[PDB]
Design a protein around this ligand. Structure first.
Ligand code: HEM
Ligand code: CL
Ligand code: CL
Ligand code: CL
Ligand code: CL
Ligand code: CL
Length: 152
């Protein structure tokens, strides 16, 4: 279920994200590369990337746009961490494009983990981060299952 963060937890999440927020596209490019490299089945889900070597596409506009759009959503979730409705709406809106798609919970959860590992959080910040991401996935998976109206 959705579990709100305290004011102090919100501050923890903002602080946890601040290095990435400060280098959003550069972090996005690195994290997205590492994700595709570690979990190579996923590149095929991106039709603009499909059929080419990862090292050939990593420097391209198409690739950087995708990595950017993922990170922009998380950046906006963070921005909305103190507003449950606003946070839910960010996710609600990005969920539609995903509903019809052959992407497993495993694939999304593998991306969450690459992000986690890149942030190297202490346990206090990590706990607050994981409250937010647990909310993220709760909302996202509810919308993938066609129960996205409940957040409206
Ligand atoms: C969980 C965090 C994610 C976020 C915040 C996110 C965000 C977005 C956004 C903003 C779009 C743009 C809407 C569009 O033009 O379709 C999009 C599209 C899309 N995403 Fe995601 N995404 C996430 C995870 C994933 C994963 C893990 C995959 C594949 C394994 C994936 C595959 C796709 C595909 C295939 C599209 C449709 C557009 C296209 O053909 O590239 N997404 N996503
Ligand atoms: Cl894989
Ligand atoms: Cl490859
Ligand atoms: Cl994406
Ligand atoms: Cl607010
Ligand atoms: Cl930390």
């Amino acid at each position: 279920a959705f579990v709100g963060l305290s004011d102090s937890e919100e501050k923890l999440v903002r602080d946890a994200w601040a290095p990435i927020h400060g280098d959003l596209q550069g972090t996005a490019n690195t994290v997205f590369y590492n994700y595709l490299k570690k979990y190579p089945s996923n590149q095929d889900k991106f039709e603009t990337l499909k059929g080419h070597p990862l090292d050939e596409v990593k420097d391209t506009a198409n690739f950087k746009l995708i990595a950017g759009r993922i990170f922009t959503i998380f950046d906006n979730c963070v921005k909305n961490v103190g507003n449950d409705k606003g946070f839910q709406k960010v996710i609600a809106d990005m969920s539609g494009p995903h509903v019809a798609r052959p992407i497993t919970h495993g694939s999304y959860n593998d991306l969450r983990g690459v992000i986690y590992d890149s942030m190297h959080l202490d346990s206090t910040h990590g706990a607050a981060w994981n409250k937010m991401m647990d909310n993220f996935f709760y909302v996202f998976y509810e919308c993938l299952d066609g129960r996205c109206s409940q957040f409206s």
